[PDB]
Design a protein around this ligand. Structure first.
Ligand SMILES: *[C@@H]1O[C@H](CO)[C@@H](O)[C@H](O)[C@H]1NC(C)=O
Length: 106
């Protein structure tokens, strides 16, 4: 509860599962998301794996959208066979931005 007033967003360290939940009877609506690494300050791991801060995966968006779209809550593995590999040997992550809208009207 208590919206952020600036879209909802969840991020999870590669290899661990991520959780999305919408308030009341709203449903998750994935707007944008990416699987990879664009920062070295998230999910502190070995420096060698955190050196590359430039890894993107567009399809990451479609995967989460299909999995969380129109759902009140959804859980996905921020790694494993649930996400390809846009940059091996690096500690990745998953960032998903979405909004919660009513499952019907009002
Ligand atoms: C969610 O529901 C709306 C209305 O029924 C539909 O247009 C939309 O396509 C659904 N989400 C997805 C991913 O299809």
């Amino acid at each position: 509860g208590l919206p952020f007033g600036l879209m909802r967003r969840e991020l999870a360290c590669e290899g661990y599962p991520i959780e999305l939940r919408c308030p009341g009877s709203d449903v998750i609506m994935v707007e944008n998301a990416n699987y990879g690494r664009t920062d070295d300050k998230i999910c502190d791991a070995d420096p060698f794996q955190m050196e590359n801060v430039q890894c993107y995966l567009p399809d990451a968006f479609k995967i989460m959208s299909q999995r969380c779209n129109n759902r009140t809550q959804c859980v996905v593995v921020a790694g494993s066979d649930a996400f390809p590999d846009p940059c091996p040997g690096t500690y990745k992550y998953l960032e998903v931005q979405y909004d919660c809208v009513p499952y019907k009207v009002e």
